[PDB]
Design a protein around this ligand. Structure first.
Ligand SMILES: [Zn+2]
Ligand SMILES: [Zn+2]
Ligand SMILES: [Zn+2]
Length: 52
């Protein structure tokens, strides 16, 4: 009943209509969804994820 980012390290604003689905989980952006492949940051407020 709550739509949040899949990244367990980052609390990002997820768009209910533009949500990136991955592994059955919801993501704010492709960045967190793809586990950040080549250093792609997410549109998070202050952001946290810098790993992987
Ligand atoms: Zn995110
Ligand atoms: Zn992330
Ligand atoms: Zn982030």
């Amino acid at each position: 009943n709550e739509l949040r980012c899949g990244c367990p390290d980052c609390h990002c604003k997820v768009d209910p209509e533009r949500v990136f689905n991955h592994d059955g989980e919801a993501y704010c952006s492709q960045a967190c969804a793809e586990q950040h492949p080549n250093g792609e940051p997410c549109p998070a407020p202050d952001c946290h994820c810098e790993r992987s």
